[PDB]
Symmetry: D2
C-alpha cells in the first residue's frame, strides 16, 4: 500500500486543515481548529510536521504573556508527537492595515510596521527550529496603473529583503528565505508574479545566497504556466528552498485543491522531477479542504494529499525503472540532450563542416522524435496499465 | 499624430510582409519584396526595419545569391535613410527545427543552429544592427518526458555562452536580447516570461551582454501585466529592445496592431517607457489580419505608430496635470519612493512608532484615493478633461 | 458627462455597501445603512437601486423587524424618488447553501431555497421591481462525482418552473433573469455563460417569463467577447437586465468599476446597447476596491456612470461620422444585413454565379478594409478625430 | 487488455492522421497521406470508420471526372475494409475566399458560394452513408468590433442553416446537422463560441429537430469551461449528435492533443458520463499527431486515443460498480439530487412548514457533503489503486 510515515517528510500549513471555509461570497462552514488538535491529528495521519503564519499561532494583538502561553502549548504538542516545524511565514495580508501592501505599501509607516512584525516572527521561527522563512507578498500589487510605481515598489521590496538578510546575518541565524510568487488574487496583479520574476529579483539582493523560492503548484497554473518546467528552472538555479503542493483546475481564482486534484498529469511529472532530482525538501501541502466538507472530510482531504503523492511517486519510479521506457527515451534522444553541444569549443565548432556546409538538413528533418509513444508509456504507467 | 523618423518607429520585414497563411488557411496576399517594404515604411514615417536571416536571403542560397540579395537590400536602406537596429535568426520554420534549435534533443541540430546564428550575427554587424534577438519558438515540449528541462537549460546556457564568446572574440559591439513566449508553437516554451528570461541571464558567463526583448502579446497570453514586467526589466537594466503589438486575452498569439487588444495596458506601457526615458527603438511585431489587402497592410502599420503617438500625448498630459500630481500625493506615491528605513536596522528595531506604538486601526482607516486617481487617468486617456 | 436620473443608472445596495472583506482579508469599511446608500446614490444622479433580500432585512428577522426595515427603506425611496427595478435572493452566503440552493443534493435545502425566493418575490412586487434576478453562485461543483449535472438541470428546471407557476398564479407582472457565471465561488458553476442560460430557458414550461442578466466580468472570466454575447441575447429577445462592471482578464471575479478592465469592449458594449435602443436600466454590479475609504466608494460609483456617458458620446460620434459610414460600406457591413438567398433554395441551386461561374480568386483578392474601420473607431474612442 | 475493435465505434477524421504538421510558424514535417492508406491503417488499428471534409476527399477545383474517380477509389477502400463514414463536413475555412467567413461573410456572393459548396457535399455525405453533417464555422467571427454586426451575422447564420434544413427536407435525406462551437482561433472571436451558444441558436431555427451539437473537448477547455458539464447539458437537451475527442492543456491555442492527454481527470469524467448515459454515437477523434512525429508516431498517437478511451472506460465502470463508491455516493446525497424537489406541487410546498418556519438551517448547515472522500475513491479507481 500507500501509507505515509514521517520518513516521507510530508508537512501541512496549520491554516490548511484549519481553514474555516469563509470565502468572499460565503460565511464560515466549520468551527476554528485548535493548532494542538491539528498537530495531533496530522501526526496520526503520518505527517512529519506543520508550518504556520505568526497569526495562526499567536492571536493578533496578544500580550507577551499570551504570546508565551500560546507558543508553550504549541511546543508541548510538537514535543509529545515528535512533529517538526520546518517553515514559518508572516501574515501580512489579513489585517486592513495591509490593504495596500506590506513591504511595498505606499505609506512608509506601514512598511516599517510590516518589517517589525516579520522580524519578531523570524525570532520565533528560529526558536521552533524552522529552517526556511517564507514570504508571500499577496497584498503587494495594484488594481490600477497609477496606484503603484513598480520600479519604486521593487526598490522597497529589495530594501525590505536586504534588511531581513542583514537581521539574520547579524543574529547568526541558520534560516533562509523563500519567496512565494503568485500572479494575482487578492490584488489585480501581484509583484513577482511567477517563479521566473522571483528568481530574477533574488539576483539583485545584497546577499542573494540567503534567498530562494517557495513555488505553489496552483499559482503557476493561474498564469497557464507549466509548473514542472518552473520547478526545473528553480532546481537548475539551486534555488528550490521549499514547495507548496496543491491542485488547480485551470486559469481562474486560486482553488488550493488537494494535491493530485486539478492537473493530474502535471502532478505526476512534478513528482517524477522532485524524485529524479533527489530534492530533499519537505513535501508541504498548502491546500483548502472545500467548504462543503465537515471535519471528517478535512482529514480525508489531508490524507488524500499524501496518498496521491505516494501513488504518483510509485508510478513515476516504475516509469523510470522500465527498460521499455528507457529504450523509448533513447529512441527520443533524451540522452543526447544531456551531452554538451560543443565541448570541443567554439573554434572547433566554427571549423566543423558537419555542423554547416555538410549538414544534411533534409535527412535530419526526416527523423521522427518518437515522443507520442514515449508519452503513451508514461500514460500507461500513471494509470497502472502496463 | 503623424510619425516621423525622430520617433524611432521600426518594423520587422515579416510583419508587413506576412502573407496571411495561418494554421487553418492559405496565404491571402502575395510575397512582399523586402525593398518595397523599406520604401513603403519610409513613406509612412518609419525609422528602420528588422529582419530574420531568412526574410532577406532565401534559405539555401549560394554565396553569390546571398551577396546579391544583401547588396540589393543595403541599396534600398541607403536610398531611403532607413536603419536596421536589430536582427534575428529563423530557427523555427524549417522542419529540421521541429524539436527545437539550441535545445533540440539531437546534438547535430544544436550545432547547426549555432552555425546558422553565427553566420547571421556577422551579417547583423555588417548591416549596423546593435541588438541580436533570440526567440526560442521551438524550444519546448508538448509532453513531459520529451524534454528534460534542467538539461535543456544547460544546452541553452551553453549556446548563449558560445555566442557571447564569439561576439567578444570578434570585437563586435552587439548585445543579445532574449524574447520570452509562454507557448505556441510548442505546448510550453522554455523561458516563458520576462522574469524567467531575466533569471536565466544571471547565470550566463557574460551576463552584461544579454537582455530581454519582451513582446506585449506574449506576457498577456499568460494573463500577466505587461507594464509591470517591463518595469522589472527596466529596474534590472535589461530592457534591450521591445516588440509592440496587441492581444485580446489569454488565447493564441494574435499580434494585433499596437493599441488594439488591451488599450489601457498600452496607455500605461507608453507612460512607463516615456517616464523612464527609455531610448530604444519603438519596434512593432504585429500581423496585419489576413482579411486585409495590401492597402489595409499599410493602414494597419500607420495605425501602430498613430496609436503610440496619441497614447504618448495623453500620458504626458496626465503627468503634467497639477490635479493628477495632487492626486498622486493624496495616494502617497511620493512616499513609495522614500526609503522604508534609511535610519538602518538597529534604529528601526528600537523605534516604538514602528511596532508597540503603531496605531494599526488609525492607519487601517486611511483611504488610498486610488479610484479618483485612476478616473483622472481614464479622463486623460479619453481626452475627457 | 454628468449623470442624471434620465440615464436610468442603477446600483446594487451591496456594491457601494461592500465592506471590503475578501478571502484573504478582513473588512476595511464599516457596514453601510441602505438608507444612506439611497440618498448618496441619488445625489450622484442615479435612478434606482437593487437588492438581495438579506441586504434589506437581517437574515432571521421576525415579521415585525422585517416590516420595520422595509418601511424604513420605502420612506427613503419615496423621499428621494429613487426606484427599485430589480430584486434578487441571497442563496449563497449562509452555510446551508454551501452545496447549492435550487440544486443542493439535499432535498430539504432545495425546498427551503424555493420558499426563501418566493417570500422575496412578494417583497420585490411590493417594492415595484419588474425583474427578479437569479444568480446560482453555489450551483456547481469542485469534483466530478459530487454533482450529476443532468439531474441538477432537472432540479433547476423544476425550481424555475415552480417560480413561474407562482408568479402566474398570483398575477404578478415580473419577469426572471438568470445571471450566468463560469466559476467562483464553485470550481464550476452551472449555466456558466450567456449561451448556456439562453439554451436552458428554452426548455422551461413558460419560456417567455425568463431572460438573462449577463455581467461583463463573468463572460470575460471565460475569455469570451461580452458584446458578442449581448448581441446574441438581444437577437433572442432575452436581454431582460444587465450588470455593468470591469474585469481584466481570465482570473478571479474583480467587479472593477465600469470602463476599467477591457476598455475597448466597454466602448463596443455601449455602442451595441445604444444602437439597438435597449431600454433596460444601466445597472452596475461592481465593488469599490477595499483600498478605498467611503469617499473613494462614491468616486468609484460616479466613475461608473461618467465612463458610460463618455463612451456613449464617442460611440454616437463614431456612428454619425460620414467617414465611418463610408468605411462601413467599404467593408460591406451593409451587405451583411442583406438576405443571402431571398430568391430561395431552388433559384440559389440554379444560379451558376453562386458556383460554377463564381470567380473564387477574384473574390479572394478583395480586401475587407477592416483595419481602417477599426482605426476610425479607435480615433473616435480616444477623441483623436 | 485494451484492444480496440470496430464494436467500440471509434472513428477518426482523415485530416487527423493526415495532418502534415504545417503550423503558422513552421513548414510541413510529413508527406501528404493517401485517404486509402488512412482507411487501411486505421482499420488495422481497430477503428470502425472515418470522417472527412469535402476537400480531404476531393481536390478543390476537381472536374466531375476527378470528383467521381476520387470518390470511387475511396469507396473501394471502405468496402474492402468494412470501414464506415458516419459523418461528413465542409471545408469552409482554408481557401482565401473564406477569409471573412462563409455563411456570415459580409460579401453576399461568398455566402451563396458557401451554401452551394456545402450542398454539394451533403449529397456526397448521403451517398457514403453519413448520418451526421457537421458545421464548424471557424472563419465566422471578427478581430475588431465594427467589422461584424453580430445580430446581422446571426440572421445570416440562421438563414444558411434554414436553407440547409429545407434542402435536406425537400430531398428526403436522413441526415442531421451538428454544429461545432469554438471560442476563438483562427478568428479573434468566433460566433457560437460554446456548447451553450450553439444549443441556444438551434432553438431559433425553423426546424430545430434537425440540428444538434458536435462539441470538441479542447474547444470548451479553450474557454476554461468544464467539458463534462457541457456535454451533460447537450445530453439533457437531447442534442448530442456527435462528439470530437481530443486533449487540451489549458487556455491557449487549440492543441488537438490525442485523447487522454491534456486534462486527464476531465477525460475520465467525460467517459464516465458518455457510458453512464448510454450515449450511442461514434467515439470520434479530432486530434493532430504533433509535428515532431514521423508516420509511425502518427499511428502510435491514433492507437493511443483509442487505448486511453478504453482504459478510462474500464476505470469509470469499476468506479460505478464499486459498492464502497455507491455507499460514498449515497453519503453525499447523490440519490436525493435525482428526487423531485416538490412532486407534491406548489401549493403543498407553500403550505409545508418544514420547508420554511420549521426548517432548521443550523442543523442543515452542519451536515458535511463528504465530497472529498468520494473524489479520492474516484482518484484511486482512475489510478488503479483501490
Ligand atoms: Co494558492
Ligand atoms: Co507574438
Ligand atoms: Co462578478
Ligand atoms: Co480543436
Ligand atoms: Mg502558498
Ligand atoms: Mg516578437
Ligand atoms: Mg452580478
Ligand atoms: Mg473538431
Amino acid at each position: 500500500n500507500y501509507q505515509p510515515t514521517p520518513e516521507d517528510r510530508f508537512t501541512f500549513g496549520l491554516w490548511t486543515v484549519g481553514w474555516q471555509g469563509r470565502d468572499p461570497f460565503g460565511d464560515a462552514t466549520r468551527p476554528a481548529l485548535d493548532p494542538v488538535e491539528a498537530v495531533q491529528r496530522l501526526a496520526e495521519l503520518g505527517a512529519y510536521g506543520v508550518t504556520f503564519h505568526d497569526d495562526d499561532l499567536i492571536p493578533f494583538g496578544a500580550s507577551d504573556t499570551e504570546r508565551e502561553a500560546h507558543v508553550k502549548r504549541f511546543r508541548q504538542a510538537l514535543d509529545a508527537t515528535g512533529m517538526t516545524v520546518p517553515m514559518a511565514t508572516t501574515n501580512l495580508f489579513t489585517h486592513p492595515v495591509f490593504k495596500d501592501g506590506a513591504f511595498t505599501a505606499n505609506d512608509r509607516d506601514v512598511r516599517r510596521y510590516a518589517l517589525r512584525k516579520t522580524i519578531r516572527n523570524i525570532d520565533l521561527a528560529v526558536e521552533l527550529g524552522a529552517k526556511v522563512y517564507v514570504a508571500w507578498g499577496g497584498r503587494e500589487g495594484a488594481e490600477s496603473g497609477a496606484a503603484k510605481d513598480v520600479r519604486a515598489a521593487l526598490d522597497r521590496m529589495k530594501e525590505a529583503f536586504d534588511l531581513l538578510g542583514e537581521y539574520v546575518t547579524s543574529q547568526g541565524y541558520d534560516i533562509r528565505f523563500a519567496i512565494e510568487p503568485k500572479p494575482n488574487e487578492p490584488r489585480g496583479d501581484i509583484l513577482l508574479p511567477t517563479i521566473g520574476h522571483a528568481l530574477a529579483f533574488i539576483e539583485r539582493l545584497e546577499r542573494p545566497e540567503l534567498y530562494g523560492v517557495n513555488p505553489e503548484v496552483g499559482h503557476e497554473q493561474m498564469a497557464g504556466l507549466n509548473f514542472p518546467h518552473g520547478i526545473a528552472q528553480a532546481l537548475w538555479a539551486g534555488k528550490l528552498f521549499h514547495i507548496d503542493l496543491n491542485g488547480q483546475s485551470g486559469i481562474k481564482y486560486d482553488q488550493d485543491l488537494r494535491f493530485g486534484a486539478g492537473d493530474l498529469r502535471a502532478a505526476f511529472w512534478l513528482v517524477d522531477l522532485l524524485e529524479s532530482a533527489g530534492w530533499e525538501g519537505p513535501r508541504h501541502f498548502d491546500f483548502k479542504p472545500p467548504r462543503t466538507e465537515d471535519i471528517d472530510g478535512v482529514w480525508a482531504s489531508a490524507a488524500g494529499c499524501m496518498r496521491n503523492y505516494l501513488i504518483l511517486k510509485e508510478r513515476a519510479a516504475a516509469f523510470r525503472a522500465d527498460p521499455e521506457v528507457q529504450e523509448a527515451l533513447r529512441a527520443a534522444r533524451l540522452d543526447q540532450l544531456a551531452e554538451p553541444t560543443a565541448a570541443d569549443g567554439l573554434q572547433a565548432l566554427l571549423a566543423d563542416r558537419t555542423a554547416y556546409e555538410d549538414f544534411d538538413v533534409d535527412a535530419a528533418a526526416a527523423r521522427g522524435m518518437a515522443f507520442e509513444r514515449l508519452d503513451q508509456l508514461a500514460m500507461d504507467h500513471l494509470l497502472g496499465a502496463r
